Every structure is written in structure tokens, then in C-alpha cells.
Amino acid sequence: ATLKEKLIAPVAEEEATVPNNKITVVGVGQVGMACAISILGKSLADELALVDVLEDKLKGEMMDLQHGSLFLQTPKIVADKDYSVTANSKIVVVTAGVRQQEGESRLNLVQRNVNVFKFIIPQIVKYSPDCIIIVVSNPVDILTYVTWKLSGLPKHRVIGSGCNLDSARFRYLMAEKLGIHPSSCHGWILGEHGDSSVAVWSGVNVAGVSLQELNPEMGTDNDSENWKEVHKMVVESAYEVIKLKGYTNWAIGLSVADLIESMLKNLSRIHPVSTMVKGMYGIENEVFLSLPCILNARGLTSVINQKLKDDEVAQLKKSADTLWDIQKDLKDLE
Amino acid sequence: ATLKEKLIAPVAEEEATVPNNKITVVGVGQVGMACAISILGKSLADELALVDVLEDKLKGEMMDLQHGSLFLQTPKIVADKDYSVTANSKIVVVTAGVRQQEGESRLNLVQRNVNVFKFIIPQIVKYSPDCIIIVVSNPVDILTYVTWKLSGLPKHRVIGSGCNLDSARFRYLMAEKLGIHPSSCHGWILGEHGDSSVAVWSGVNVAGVSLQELNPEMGTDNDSENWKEVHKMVVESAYEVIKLKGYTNWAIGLSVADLIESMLKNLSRIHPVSTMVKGMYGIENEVFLSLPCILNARGLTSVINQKLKDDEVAQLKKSADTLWDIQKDLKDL
Amino acid sequence: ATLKEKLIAPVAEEEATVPNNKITVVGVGQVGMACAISILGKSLADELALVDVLEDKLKGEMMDLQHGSLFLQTPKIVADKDYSVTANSKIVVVTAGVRQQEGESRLNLVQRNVNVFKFIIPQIVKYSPDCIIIVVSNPVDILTYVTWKLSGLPKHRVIGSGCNLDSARFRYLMAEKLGIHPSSCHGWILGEHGDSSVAVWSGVNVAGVSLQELNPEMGTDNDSENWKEVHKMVVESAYEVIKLKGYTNWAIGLSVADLIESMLKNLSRIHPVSTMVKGMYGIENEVFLSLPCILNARGLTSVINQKLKDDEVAQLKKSADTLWDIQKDLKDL
Amino acid sequence: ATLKEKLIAPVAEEEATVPNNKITVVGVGQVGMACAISILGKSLADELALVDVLEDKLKGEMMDLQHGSLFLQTPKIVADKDYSVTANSKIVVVTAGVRQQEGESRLNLVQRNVNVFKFIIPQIVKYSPDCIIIVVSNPVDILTYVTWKLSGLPKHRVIGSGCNLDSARFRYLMAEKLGIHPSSCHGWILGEHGDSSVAVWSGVNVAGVSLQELNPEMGTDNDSENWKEVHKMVVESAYEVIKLKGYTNWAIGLSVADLIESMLKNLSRIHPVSTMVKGMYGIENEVFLSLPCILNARGLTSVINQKLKDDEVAQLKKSADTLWDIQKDLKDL
Ligand SMILES: NC(=O)C1=CN([C@@H]2O[C@H](COP(=O)(O)OP(=O)(O)OC[C@H]3O[C@@H](n4cnc5c(N)ncnc54)[C@H](O)[C@@H]3O)[C@@H](O)[C@H]2O)C=CC1
Ligand SMILES: NC(=O)C1=CN([C@@H]2O[C@H](COP(=O)(O)OP(=O)(O)OC[C@H]3O[C@@H](n4cnc5c(N)ncnc54)[C@H](O)[C@@H]3O)[C@@H](O)[C@H]2O)C=CC1
Ligand SMILES: NC(=O)C1=CN([C@@H]2O[C@H](COP(=O)(O)OP(=O)(O)OC[C@H]3O[C@@H](n4cnc5c(N)ncnc54)[C@H](O)[C@@H]3O)[C@@H](O)[C@H]2O)C=CC1
Ligand SMILES: NC(=O)C1=CN([C@@H]2O[C@H](COP(=O)(O)OP(=O)(O)OC[C@H]3O[C@@H](n4cnc5c(N)ncnc54)[C@H](O)[C@@H]3O)[C@@H](O)[C@H]2O)C=CC1
Ligand SMILES: CNCC[C@H](Oc1ccc(C(F)(F)F)cc1)c1ccccc1
Ligand SMILES: CNCC[C@H](Oc1ccc(C(F)(F)F)cc1)c1ccccc1
Distance between CA B77 and CA B89 in Å, rounded? Predict the structure, then answer.
């Protein structure tokens, strides 16, 4: 007999087991592995599946993770260029494609990553018809729209990682000013994950105290405390970090892990993420951008209606315009 | 014009949710709440259901937990005398029934808790036919047997918390001896969760160093390290705690959470838990007692075969005879 | 020639080291043990010390926790009626004294519990001159004032658990009404942890959306929603739970641990807790009541100044007057 | 008045605070950042400090982590090429230096990395004279010797990550073969973190069942289950992963965090880490290699005396000689 047979006496019939909280990460570059190690660190998946077109690095990442297995709570890790290995995922994180060169706008990536997504979105849905797709690749709003169209999935099951990260950055910068933890700072960056984002100044608050009531000039050009510069640091953050170390990955990895935690624990927590906002704030096309949404096990099930101020609605409309201007030229999507 | 309608714009239609990791704790006493609170503390459930016969205390425990929701990760906590609230439970923990008085053996409770289990076990399976059942009430070995029989579930879905806790206690006393963390001490108490439990001296080791190898008289009357008294402390521990504070609950609630974690995260980790050991070590009947078992999302799917020494095998058989003497006379199971 | 001596070769010479994260809990009742298990399950202490007047209960509780050690990350669990066991604690949580009977106001617990504190507090300060004290016993506001006075510690090191719990409950009720997690609902209950607490309607908000903007009648009697009813449920919660199960413990246990976590990890997070509010909002004496405060490793280092509406300031003055009426007549402090 | 002066009212005076649990990571490469994120994900440090000679990369890594601050529990993240930033670190991880090329042996990296450490280690002890140093850069056993000599620290505060990773790899492969979780398989890979590591077959056990009792040919060349091939996979794993992805980093980050947790929580758990083994198993010189060691807040305070088999003592003495043969010719330490 094998050692296994000497040691192990079966009590159950052997059986094909169906993973419950299977997560797939697509693309195992900087962002993909940031997301993967964050997912594994929070024990969010009982099965992790990696997909990339670079087979050698894909197998290497899978082996490195598997070696850390003693320290994790994920009994199965699997990797393949073939999407069969992503079968029955609850959530598929898509991180594949080109990124920004230094100084380069995410919008300049569209045409390349669109061609990438046309190949990978169908495959996801072939093997995980019931999954939630979290889109990360840039430009994230456009490609969330593109994934929704390409997948034929319900709007609530195709989420763009959107401004979660921008908002996190916002709240850290405010936190650094006030000397309090970021989670005790409340503020929402909305719209495009990019240059046209919108700082909802009217919502920024500590312990229910409106900071715009303490500082009516907050977010104007004439503001002795210059909070416009905080929104600007938020807008420029990606470019500065890309200039310094060539990419960003740890922050987005943590943010994606936060979204996943809200969905798999069925928490119904509110996250600023990218969704179709046709018919709100006067936007008239099928634009995707970040609004506050309720995330739980079903995916994105609600948007929060806000009492945006005039200049804030105007910024949001301009961001919607910038995005639709690129969306309207996107063909061959079904 | 409701504030919820003003505030929330729906994206998906509202649908009826079935929970993924629903756990039910039956009995909301010292042990039941210790279990519920350990379960919530580790975010093991997306839905906790409490069941008891005391409707007032039940709703009170439920409300106190819900008041804690801000600090938890469990969106739905519910409670009811009616087992319909437990439907679709992935795991059901049974803690309901009578407990030991001071000095009282756990076997003394069989008659009463059989009558208890004969009512609740059916109710459980009636509403969650695919669940795993973790028996905690005493005597837990005999009651896991009773539960297996009444439920009609496969033996891999009926689990008795067993000696997980005895072994935790053993490992604590070991680490106290040695100045190491309990998780770096290894040693298994097996057999009855009670006075007939067996210390597997041949398995006791620190970092793969057999301590019986550095002491062939480990566990005997002529033992300079006096390990026998450690096994006696493990055996007497419940009674001592019961005398000092009337009951035990914290360690067992942590134990049961450990088991649930291994099963919900599907780790196939090995725990000394109570299972049907017919055909092992010369035991000829469907005795339930604790052995090392592999636990995962299907439940208790394998037992580990061990090369027990003769004396260990003999204590194990004696423990099986103790239990089977009670089991063989139970009726209408 | 002992087992330890043969198994372990020393690399460092034996020294007595001081714990880095010692927490003491005073009182091992329902609340003290809910606190202990919450602290242990979050691995917030490297040494936990339990103190009570009931020596047997105390030993029993300590033994139960130690028997759970395998599942925990606290290598030292110690218990004694002598406060020498609490020496060098970073945080001391006081949960000792009488609690409310059915329907009893917390302010009716004053004299009894003041006497208790007069003995407990000096002992704490003798053995942990540098600790932060978290007062939990009721009335928590008046007793936080008492502890400040008895101890001689600075204001930033005497913290009343206060309305953290009240707000928790508020946020839970809110979440039930809106169908979101309590953490994504924001709203502040301030003032006394008791009947005169103040719902800060003007701060209530989801995702930065002022709920009193979508509903300016919020908190009045002309309200289509029943928000005042939410605040009333908050006020009555403790009585309702005391009536169903005789006491409350799980939610306050999680609240105390939430505060300890902000402190020990130095996060400077904002919690509504009881501090000395003389000179704010027109309050004229050294009243202790809950405001939103920045907590971290030094303790309670800032209060948040808020733009309370006139009715809110008025309710807060009414709270502070209820409390000061009791305080002013307190002697031998 | 500033917005912050309006918002925040001081309760305590301003004061400079010392981090309680500061960790510095030296080198922000693949491995350094893998360690960094592993430490942050476990909320192991209240202050994280990064050091590297690449100023731009250094600042960028720092900025990324800060932008993740909302999802974390480390309130202060600093970085600089100046070691002033590392002042008062409790633990300093050293990951800086050259790494293996494809197929290259770690020993071939000594010269270059000695020149690294001759600069780095004196800086470290300059600002944290009391710290523990975890050496990760390769060759890790040799560089741990170098760090010990250069730092003038006591042995219990210079720890090489050693075979913690090798054993992790060992256990994973073993779990893969048995269908159980790696934590329920026990097995020690000792000696050099390199081609001369020793597999301690006599300790390999599941639930205390010695697997070399069921397979007495385990470890030999005449073993139909080819356990020696498992040890081979452990020795080759780093080369295979380097050939596939260019380096390894995640598994060692997790291993390092596991060590840090044992020490900062004062758990006294046992890890296979590199210590100075002179006078052990016939080793005559100040060689560093991995044995099972107790780790707690003081550092590496104990080694576990093992009853190795003759062949295993042999492979360990070969490892020692392989190492000392390089160690002995190093200058200016
Ligand atoms: N939403 C956000 O906040 C952020 C978005 N991003 C975006 O994330 C995406 C990736 O960034 P990095 O991880 O640093 O790039 P990376 O180059 O370091 O890794 C990208 C991965 O995509 C893989 N890939 C390309 N086409 C593929 C296909 N058809 N199938 C499978 N794999 C494919 C490449 O092999 C590579 O391994 C980029 O678009 C970047 O702009 C980056 C950071 C934050
Ligand atoms: N396996 C182990 O390691 C341990 C086992 N136990 C056992 O666990 C059990 C619970 O002990 P405690 O929480 O201290 O007793 P407890 O009195 O504090 O609570 C038991 C609960 O069971 C409830 N209950 C009784 N009959 C019921 C019925 N027919 N249906 C529904 N609920 C019913 C009672 O109302 C009570 O609320 C006892 O059997 C005790 O012996 C306790 C400690 C250790
Ligand atoms: N602030 C809050 O949100 C809440 C506060 N509380 C308060 O917490 C306190 C404890 O309530 P419970 O734990 O349910 O009562 P509990 O009756 O279960 O007893 C707590 C312990 O107080 C101990 N004690 C009395 N004098 C002592 C002394 N001099 N030294 C050490 N221990 C002493 C008793 O022996 C008892 O063990 C009460 O004052 C209650 O009002 C309760 C719930 C919430
Ligand atoms: N013990 C173990 O199991 C393992 C050890 N290692 C070792 O980790 C070390 C680093 O590996 P990687 O992160 O992949 O290489 P890396 O090439 O990605 O980054 C190494 C960092 O060291 C920095 N550095 C070089 N000299 C420095 C100095 N004097 N001060 C500060 N920073 C300096 C470089 O700037 C680089 O940024 C290597 O020696 C490698 O062998 C690698 C894997 C596991
Ligand atoms: C895991 N599936 C089998 C579980 C159990 O089957 C068994 C029936 C008898 C025995 C026996 F006889 F003790 F060996 C052992 C097992 C059973 C019995 C009745 C209904 C379902 C399962
Ligand atoms: C950081 N907290 C400041 C220290 C505090 O000092 C006081 C501050 C204010 C007052 C009061 F209330 F104005 F009288 C009284 C004392 C104090 C109180 C008692 C003992 C020591 C310090």
C-alpha cells in the first residue's frame, strides 16, 4: 500500500468538490499579484486561480504562492493560460493589459486594452457564467463599460474598481492633515478614475462635522487652506508614483481586496466604484463612472443618490462627457 | 417618498438571498453563547441563527449580538424557538441540554439529553438536510452516536467536538512545563471526552522529538517527569473549573470555532474529534469516540491510522467498552 | 537532567522581561468576561490579568481562558484578588460593581458603585502608574469623573466607555432601516450613556449625504419617518435586553475591544467616549460625558468640535445638568 | 484659526511618542516589499520604515503603501536612504543585496553582499542598538554570521530566516502528497538554506504518527515513494521558481512575517531559523545554520536539542563544513 493508504482511513466517499469562494485573478503582473497576495492574506478565497499569457511567469507565481501555503488558508492554488482553470469562480478580477508609461494618460491606453479585453471577457463568462467581474485594468471606467457589453452580464455583476482607490488616497491626505486615522476621515472622489475626477467637497466630514461648513471656501481657487491642492495631489498621485517606481500596485491590491471582502461576506457596504449611471445627474448615455454603491454577495445592487452641489454636478457631468467621448467610438462589442 | 427610496436607487431587482455560510447554534447558555461569540469574532458566518426553548433569553442574546453588529462581519443574526429559522444551515452546533453538577460524571446526563436530542435532531435535519452537525452537549460521544442514528446523515456530517478540547488542555499543560507556545507542543488525548480518555504518549513531541524517546517511562508509575499527573489534570480539569465557576464555556467555544474554521475554509486540517470507530483498533461495535480526523467543507472525511502502543490500545478499548455499555441499551434511535 | 533541561539549550540568559501589551480587566462578571474574550480573540494583549473579589470565580475564569490558549495569542493569563498581579498594565478596564435591575436607572447605582471605586481605583494606580483606565461600570460618566479624581491621572488617561455602544446601537438600527452595513451608516449619540443621551441628527449621514437634508423633520414629531423612535429604541435598548436576559455584555465587550484596538495600535481613530467637557457647549463644571474623541497610544488626546444645532446643544446641556447634579454632591474624592 | 484648530480641541499636550512596535525593512526589492505587505496585512507594526539606496523607488514604494493606509492599521509609514528613519526599530529585516542569477548558487553571492553588509549593519545598530535583526539576504547563514560579528549584538538578537521557508516548502509538498493542510504535516528541513539542507526524516509525522515507521525506507535511495525526491524538490524549488519568474519573494515574505509575529506577540513558538551552532552535534566553529529555535519578544532565546539519526548528524556536519569553509576566510568583521 501507499503511505497515504497506510495513514488515511476514508470516512467519506471521494468526490469532486465544488469550491465555494473561488476567486480568479487575470494578469499576474504587479497589480495582479498585489491583488492575489491581499486576497490570500485576508483568507478570502478557498481556491485561487491565476491566468496570464506568459506561461513561465504564471507557473512561477503559482509555485511561489503555493510555497507560502503553510502561512495561508487557501487549500488550492491553480494557474493556467487556459481559462478552464477559472471554472466556477465567484469573482474574477481582471488586471491584464498595458499600463501607463510615465506621464501618459490612462485614456491613451484604451485601444490597446480594448483589444485585450475582447479576447478575455468571453472566456471568463464561458467558464464562470455566474461570476462577478471586478475590472481593474485602465482606463477602468471605459473597460468596465466594455466588459459589461462584451459579457452580456447584468449591470450588478460587472464592477469597475473605480474611485475606491482615489477615495482612499483622498482620505489618507486629509488624514495626514488632521492627524487622525484615514477611516475616521470621510470624503468621496467620484466620476472618472483619472484626470476628471470629482471631489465631493460637500460630503467631506469628520464625525459628522461638515468641513465645508467649517471652511465655505473649501475647494475654490480662493481658499487660504488650499484643499483644491488635495484633490490635485489625488489626481496626480498615479503619475507621481509611476514616475518614482514605474507602476503602482499595493494600494489598488488592498482596495480590490476591500471590495472583495464586502461582496463575499455579504456586508452591503458602500464603496465608490464604477457603474452605469445612465439617467442620473442628467447624464444621457450609458456612461460608466464611480458613484457610491452597495456591495454585497450579489455584486453592485444599489447606487446612493446624493445632493451634489452645483459645481459638483457640473464636474461630474464634465467627467461623464470626457468618458462618453471615448465610449461613443467603441465598435464590435455586441 | 420613503427615505430609503429617496436615498437608494436600485441597480439589481431585490431578490431573496440564501446564505452561504449559515451557522446555527442550538442552546444559548454559557457554552452556546461562548460558541456564538467565537464564531462571530472570526467572521465565520454570514448568518447566525440562535435556537432555544427560553424565548426571552433567546431574543435577549440575539439583540445583544445585533447591537454588536458594527464591530462584526455578519449581516444577519436571527433567533427563534421554531427550527424554521435555521433552514439552510451549513453547520449546526448543538449545545442544548443539561450539564454536569459539581462532581457529576458526564454519563449521568445521557437519559436526559437523549430525550432532548430525540426532539431537536429531527427538527435540525428537517430544515437543513445537507448540513454538518457538530455535537457539543454531554456526554458528547454518546450524543454524537444518538445524533448519527436519529438524523440519518452520513457519518462524515455528524461530528462530536470530542477531545479537541482535552487535547487543547493537554497542550497547554505541556507548554507550561516547557515554556513554549501550546501550538509548538504536540500530543493527542483520544477516546472518551471524560474520565476514560487516553493520552497517546508515543505521539507526544516537540519539533519531531519524541518525548517518550527521551523517557521510556513517560506515563507510567515510575516516571521522573510525572506525565501521568498531567493526564490526570486533563481529566480533572472540567470538574475543577466547574467547582470554581460552576461550568466551563470559554475553551470549548474556542474549540468549536477552531473546528468550524477548518471546515468552512476547507483546509483539511486534523483535529481529535468524535467519530464512529467500528473496525479500528479491535473495536467491534459502532462506538463513537475521538480520533484524529481530517476536517474540511464536506465535514469529517477521513480518520488517521496510528501505530498505538499496546497500553494505549488497551486504554482505548476500555474507553470504548465504557461508552458501548451505555450505547447498547438506548432505544428508539 | 529534567525534560526541559534535556530538550532546550539556552541561547539567551534568563531575564525577567516586561510585557509590552498588558491589559487588566477588573471584574470577571458578564461584562468583564465579554471584554476578556473580545480582547483575547483580537490578540490585543500579550498578558491578560483578571481581578475580582470572588476568588473562586476568578480562578475558574482564568483556568477556562488558559485552557483555550492553544487557539489564542496571549502567552500569559494571570488572576488574583491582589492588585500586584495587575502591575505594569498598559490598559486597565473596570467592570466591577453592581448593575441595573429590571427597569432601574444607571444613576441609581451611584453611591454603591462609588464606594466600590474608592477601593479599586487607588489600587490600580499603585501598580500601573502609567496605564490608561477604561471605565465601563455604571454610571460610566459619573464613575469616569470619580476615577479621574481618585487616581490623579491626567484627563487623557481616564476614558469612559461612554456612548461608543449607544452609537453602535444607533448605527445598527439605522442599518436595519436602510439595508446596509452599520459601518456605512454614520451617526453620533453623545452625552450621557443613559436616558438623557443626545441624537446628533445633523451629523447623521450615509456616504456623506446628510439625512436631515433629505428629511428636515428628522428628530421632530412631524416626522414621516420615525427617527425619534430610533433614538428612543437606543435609549430603551439596555432595559429591553436586561428584561430578556438579565444584563447586557456581548455588545459592550466588542465596544471595549474596539476602543482598546484604536489605542494599542495608535491609530488615532474617533470614538464617542466619555471625557471631561468643562468649557464646551456652555457647560460650566467638570462634567464627564461622551463626545467624539481621538484615541491612540497616549489615550484620549483630542475632542472634536462640532457645529451642533441649537436643539442639540440644548439636549446636551440637559444631559450635562442631569450628570452634574449628581457630581456636585460627591465627597471624599 | 486653522481648519484643524477649529475642528480639533487638544485634550493632552503635544508630546513626541516612541513607536511601540517599529519594524524597518532594509531593501524594497521583490523580497523587501513582499515582507512589507505581509507585515502590514497582519497589522504587525505601528510604524513601518523602509530603507534603500534607490531614492526614487524608495519614495514610490512608501507612497503606494501610504495610499493603502485606509485598509491598513499602521498609522506611520516612512522611508529614506538615511538610517535615521529606522531609529527605535524593534525589528529590522535586512533584504538588501544581489540575488541569484538563473542556476546560480547562493554562496556565489558572498563577496558582493559582504560589501553591502559592511555598510548596512553598522548603520542599523547605530539607530536601534536594542533591535532584533532578521537576516534574509543570501547567503543567509553566512550573512547572519557577518551581521552577528559586525553588529556586536548578542546571539539571541541576530536571526537568519534560515530554513523556515525550506520547511514551509517541505510541508507543502508533504501536504500535497497526503491531501491534508500543510499545518497538519510536521517536518523539519535544517542546516544550510541551500543545496546542503538536511531533511530530518525521523521527525516527519502527521498527528504524531512517525511516517518513517510506516515507510522505513523514507529518506533512502531504495524507497518506492521517493521521499528523497521530496527533499530534492525542496532544494531545487528556488532555482525552478527563479527560472520561471526571475526570483522568489511571496513565500519568503510570508515566512518572515510568521517569524515577526512569533516575536512581537511573545509567543515562544518554534521555527527552523539560522543560529550560531558551535558546540552542537560535533560542530567545532562558529557556524550559523538552522535548527528549531524558540522565538519570542526577547528574540531567539533557545535551541531544541534533537536526537538526530547518525546519517542526519552526518548531513548536518557536512552542511556545517560547507559553510565554515567560506566563513573562515572572511576579513574585517
Ligand atoms: N484601477 C486602478 O486603480 C489601477 C489600474 N491599473 C491598471 O492595471 C493594469 C495592469 O497594470 P500592471 O499589473 O502593473 O501591468 P503588468 O505589465 O506589470 O502586468 C500586466 C499583465 O497583463 C498580462 N496580460 C496582457 N494581456 C493578457 C491576456 N490577453 N491574457 C492574460 N494576461 C495578459 C501581462 O502578461 C502582464 O503579466 C493596467 O492597465 C494598469 O494601467 C494599475 C494600477 C491601479
Ligand atoms: N464537549 C465539551 O467539551 C463540553 C460540553 N459541555 C456541555 O454542553 C452543554 C451546555 O452546557 P451550558 O451552555 O453550560 O448549559 P446551560 O444551562 O448554561 O445552557 C443550556 C441551554 O440549553 C437550553 N436547552 C435545554 N433543553 C433544551 C431543549 N429541549 N431545546 C432547546 N434548548 C434547550 C437551555 O434552555 C439552556 O439555555 C452541556 O451539555 C454541557 O455538559 C459543556 C462544556 C464542555
Ligand atoms: N457602560 C456600558 O455600556 C455598560 C456598563 N455595564 C456595567 O458594567 C458593570 C458590570 O455589569 P456585569 O459584569 O453584568 O455585573 P456582574 O454581576 O456579572 O459582576 C461583575 C463583577 O463585579 C465584581 N465586583 C464587585 N466589587 C468588586 C471589587 N471591589 N473588585 C473586583 N470585582 C468586584 C463582582 O464580584 C462581579 O464578579 C455594571 O456596573 C454594569 O452596570 C453593563 C453593561 C454596559
Ligand atoms: N533567505 C531566503 O529564503 C531568500 C533570500 N533572498 C535574497 O533576498 C535578497 C534580495 O532579493 P530581491 O528583493 O529579489 O533582490 P532586488 O533586486 O528586487 O532588490 C534588492 C534591493 O536591495 C537594494 N540594495 C542593494 N544594495 C543596497 C544597500 N547597500 N542598501 C540598501 N539597499 C540596497 C537594491 O536597491 C534593491 O532595491 C537577495 O540576496 C536574495 O538572494 C531571496 C529569496 C529568499
Ligand atoms: C458516509 N456515509 C455512510 C454513513 C453511514 O453509513 C454506515 C453504516 C454502517 C456502518 C457500520 F456498520 F458501522 F460499519 C458504517 C457506516 C450512514 C448510515 C445511514 C444513512 C447514511 C449514512
Ligand atoms: C492631559 N490631561 C490634563 C491633566 C489634568 O489636568 C487638569 C485639567 C483641567 C482641570 C479642570 F477641570 F479645569 F479643573 C483639572 C486638571 C489632570 C488632572 C488630574 C491629575 C493629573 C492631570
Answer: 13
What separation in Å is there between the alpha carbon of A50 and the centre of ligand 6? 59
Amino acid (1-letter code) at residue B168: A
Identity of the amino acid at C175: A
Q: How far apart are CA B306 and CA B204, in angstroms?
A: 13
**Method of determination used here:** X-ray
| CB-CB contact of B188 with B167 (8 Å) | yes
What does the angle CA D231 – CA D232 – CA D234 come to, to the nearest 5 degrees? 65
Shortest CA gap B15–chain A (Å): 9
Pocket test for ligand 1, best of A85, A115, A138 (most atoms within 8 A of CB): A138
User: What is the Cα–Cα distance from A32 to A25, expressed in whole angstroms?
Assistant: 6
Give the separation between CA A29 and CA A293, rounded to whole angstroms. Answer: 28
The Cβ of residue A68 has, within 10 Å, a number of other Cβ atoms equal to 29
Distance from CA of A20 to the nearest CA of C (A): 23
**Where do the H-state alpha helices sit in C103-180?**
110-127, 140-151, 164-178
Of C187, C200, C267, the CB nearest to A181: C267
Amino acid letter, residue A276: M
Domains, chain B? 18-160 (3.40.50.720), 164-327 (3.90.110.10)
SS (H, E, C) D112-156: HHHHHHHHHHHHHHHHCCCCEEEECCCCHHHHHHHHHHHHCCCHH
Residue C12 in contact with partner chain D when CB distance is under 8 A: yes
Contact A255, D71 (CB under 8 A): yes
Distance CA C87, CA C90 (A): 9
**Is any Cβ of chain C less than 8 angstroms from the Cβ of D205?**
no
- The CA-based angle C81-C86-C88, given to 5 degrees, is 165
SS3 C190: strand
Resolution in units of Å: 2.1
Report CA-CA distances (Å) from B114 to A199, B28, B117: 64, 19, 5
Is residue B96 in contact with ligand 2, taking CB distance under 6 Å? yes
Identify whether B182 is preceded by a cis peptide bond (ω within 30 of 0): no
Chain D residues inside the 8 Å CB shell of B201 = none
- Pairing outcome for strands A76-79 and A198-199: unpaired
d(CA D245, CA A58): 8
Interface subset of B 24-53, CB within 8 angstroms of C: 33-34, 37-38, 41-42
Identify the residue whose cell numbers are 527563479. Answer: D242
- Can B193 be counted among the known catalytic residues? yes
Minimal C-alpha gap between B328 and chain A (Å): 23
Which SS3 state, helix, strand or coil, does residue D318 take?
Answer: helix
Which listed residue (C186, C193, C231, C271) is catalytic? C193
Residue nearest to atom 11 of ligand 6 (CA): C286
Residues in chain B with CB shorter than 8 Å from the CB of C181 are 75
**Cell representation of residue A185:** 476621515
Within an 8 Å CB–CB cutoff, is residue A294 touching chain C? yes
Ligand 2 centroid to Cα of residue C274, in Å, is: 38
Helix (H, G, I), strand (E, B) or coil at C38: helix
Instruction: Give the containing element (helix H, strand E) for B261.
Output: helix B250-264
Would the CA dihedral through C227, C228, C229, C231 be positive or negative? Answer: positive
B75–A293 C-beta distance less than 8 A? no
Q: Which of C155, C283, C328 to mutate to test the pocket of ligand 6 (most atoms within 8 A of CB)?
A: C155
Q: Cα dihedral sign for C244, C246, C248, C249?
A: negative
Shortest CA distance to A252 belongs to which of A27, A5, A9, A1? A27
Confirm if D113 and D138 have CB atoms less than 8 A apart: yes
Contact B79, B58 (CB under 8 A): yes
Helix axes B55-68, C227-245, angle to 10 degrees: 130
D285 to chain C, any CB pair closer than 8 A? The answer is no
